[PDB]
Symmetry: C11
Subunit: 129 residues, 11 copies
């Protein structure tokens, strides 16, 4: 139980890291009072810190049980039912594919071979200067 | 009977390996109580561990017998019936293919050879600077 | 609390830095009176300096509280609800994608292979001069 | 009579080699009881082993005689009838092909030679920097 | 207060620099009287010199105050309202984009992969001379 | 009279060489009884061996006489009639071809020479980095 | 006051330099009388020399005053009114452009990425001779 | 009179050389009786040998006289009538061709020269890595 | 006054130089009488020599005066009226061009950037032989 | 008077050289009687030899006079009438061509120069491997 | 007066040089009587020699006078009228061309610059083998 890292996979680490400095910033020259900039910084940080913990405690645990049952059902079906079904499909469709390929290569093959004779008389003259 | 590997083919090894850390993760700063993070980890792991074993025991064995009979029938037909049928198809269609090829090469062959004379007068002048 | 930098991220630092010299400028030859150029410089700088501070004090703090609550709600939903939902979608749509791919590669594959024979008779003659 | 190889041509050796490990496999972590994994392995292997031999004995031999007669008839016709027929076709169609070629090269030949003069004035200037 | 440069940014320095020599010029041979060329030069320079100063004094200062107030309002809205609004838009539209991408890559992906087989049989013969 | 080779031209040597091993083959693991595999091999080989000889004896010789007369007639016509006829065709069509070529090169030749001036102003700038 | 150059900018120096020799010229063999070639040269030069000076004196000066006033008005408006107006336009149109870009990159981006897979199977064979 | 070569030009030497071995051939394994293969070889060779000589004797000589007269008439007309007629055609059509060329180069020449300016601003950046 | 050159600019020196030898010429073999070739040479040269001088004397001088006045008027208008008018046009049309450019680069810019992703997956395989 | 060569120009030397060996030829194996091959050779050669001389004597000379007069008339017209007429055509059509060219280069020239800016942003990345 | 060359310009020297040998020629084997070949050569040469001289004497001189007057008129008009007219056309059409160019470069210029961004993401992978 790592209570320091809590995320050694970098899955949710791009759009869920928000700080006060990443929202509001005054570059230079356009400043405000000292008594207004030291008060807004504290209000934003404290408010969102405590509010998140309240939501995670009420319906955080009754939601983890639901996902546990659902993933178990999907895992069982894939291993024992879907995989054998897909493999058996290849053996069945063998005669149709082989016969169809022979018919196509008999009709349209000579038509597209005489058309390709237009590139057989290319002559290029080059003169460097 | 390898009770450690159970899969020396890496067939189902990409979309059926799911852990708790791959679902829910809190990167940094946005944390929860210590008493809520050590309880959700246990609930998810234990629930899906025991539930999968219950399904595999009830109708795991009566399902293996069904696949045994079905694969035997497909194997016999392919070896003794389909393979000789496809091979005999090539010998039959010989006269049609040979006669058809001669007719096409007699009509459209000269038409596509005079068109290819447009590339026989290419002249290029190059001057480096 | 850095009261000098106030923006170590260069977020709003391109379209919010405006000075008097960046608005009005007389290049050369076309000048005005000395008593009119030293008065307009002071009026523009002083007026916008004090006016900005008045707005930031009235409704600057009651606006920071509103953004604090809103961001907390979005963070919770993404971690615990959206991420597990998207991952479970991949496992469900497996049989449909695999079967569909086999059907397409059986029908149109030989058609687009005989068409590509037109580039198999390219002959080029080159003569340097 | 090789009773070990039985296939020194690798003809049917890709889609007819099926084992238990190639159908059902549990990668890791998602395991079952030891008493359920040692029983399903035996049931699948034994059932398909004996079932195939039953089919091959009943109507395996009365099917080999049928293919013997059919192939003999096709072999005789190809050698003595089809081959002389195709060869005699070339000698007959000689006058038609020669006369037709002369007519096409007389009409459309000059038309496609004046069109190819658009590539005779190519000038390229290059400057490295 | 630089009374010499008055424009160390080259903002308005291309289309507002006009002299007498840049308007009227007589190259050679086609000349005029000496008493007409020394009088038109003085009239153009003096007239536009004094006229510009008259306009800049009347309504030059009452116009600088107006621009001061307007720029202050735009600066405040961008920092505190627009920037947080745009950032929060990205977090909301996450589920829609991810699901839509999966559907498109499932349907049309195999169609555009079999079409690209027409370039897999390119043969080129080259003969230098 | 070579009774060993009987075919020193490799004419019919690709689609008329069929053996038992090229039709039916069991790769590995999926085997049959020893008493069923040594009986089907003999039945297929013996049946087609004797059946072919029966057909070749009945109407093998009365068919060779027919082809002898037919080829003699075609040979005589080609040498004495077709060849002189084709050669005399070239001398007759001389005036028509020469006059037609002059007319085409007079009308459309200048039209396709002014169109080719669009490639006479190509300029390329290259900068390596 | 340069009375020799009068145009150190080469502004009007291409289409306003006309001499007698640039209009009428007799190359060789086709000559005229000596008494007709020495008289036409003088008439053309003298006539246009004096006529230009007459026009420049009458309404040359009353035309320079008009251009003096007009240029002063345009200079004032550009510096004090147009330049601030254009700059303030960029700050206003920020939210619209950013939101619109995100929507386009979400819908049509995956469509044009699967189409580009047709160039991923290029094979070229080269044989020098 | 060469009674051995009879054809020192290889004119009819490709489609008129037919032997028994080029028609019927049994590759290997599929053989016939010795008493049937030594009889068909003799029948085909003898039958076509004597039959050709019978045709060449009956109407071989009365056919050579006919071709003698016909070729004499064509030779005389070409030398004395066709050749002078074609040459005189070039001198007559001189004025029409020269005038027509001038008209075309006057109208459409400038139109196709301004269109070719689209290739005059090509810039390429290359970066090796 | 150069009475020898009379044209040191090569203006009219290509289509106004005509001699007797450039009109009529008899190459070889097809000659005429000596008394007819020495008389036609003199008649052509003398007739056109004297006729040109007659035209140049009658209305050669009254035509030079007309061109003198006309060129003076065009020169004055270009220097004093046209040139200032064109320059003042650029200053006026500044606001329209700048605003229009911003609008176009906001709407259609992202549309033509996602389309260009079809060239980002080019793979080429080369094999020399 | 060369009675051996009679054609030192190779004008009619390709389609008027016909011998007996170029018409009828028996390659090998398919021969005729010795008494039929030595008789057809003589009949063809003698018949066409004497027949040509008969035609050349009757109306060979009365045909040479006709061509003599006709060529004289065409030669005279070309030298004295056609050549001066074509040359005088160029001088007449000068004003029309020059004015027309200026008008075309004024209207459509800028239209086809802005279109060519699409090739000014080409970037290529190359990675050898 | 060169009575030997009579054409030191090679103007009419290609289609007016005709000899007897360039019209009628008998290559070899197909000859005529000696008394018919020495008579046709003389008749053709003598007839066209004397006939040409008769035409050149009757109306050869009265035709040279006509061309003398006509060329004099065209020469005078080109030098004194056409050349000044064309030059004065350029000065008149100056304002129209300059204003029109500015308008076109303002409207359609940005449209064709955003379209050219499709070539800015080209990536090529090469692998030698």
């Amino acid at each position: 139980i790592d209570l320091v890292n809590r995320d050694p996979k970098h899955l949710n680490d791009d759009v869920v890291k928000i700080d006060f400095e990443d929202v509001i910033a005054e570059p230079e020259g356009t400043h405000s009072f000292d008594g207004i900039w030291k008060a807004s910084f504290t209000t934003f940080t404290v408010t969102k810190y405590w509010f998140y913990r309240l939501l995670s405690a009420l319906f955080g645990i009754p939601m983890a049980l639901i996902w546990g049952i659902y993933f178990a059902i999907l895992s069982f079906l894939h291993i024992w039912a879907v995989v054998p079904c897909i493999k058996s499909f290849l053996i069945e469709i063998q005669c149709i594919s082989r016969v169809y390929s022979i018919y196509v290569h008999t009709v349209c093959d000579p038509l597209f071979e005489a058309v390709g004779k237009i590139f057989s008389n290319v002559r290029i003259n080059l003169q460097k200067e």
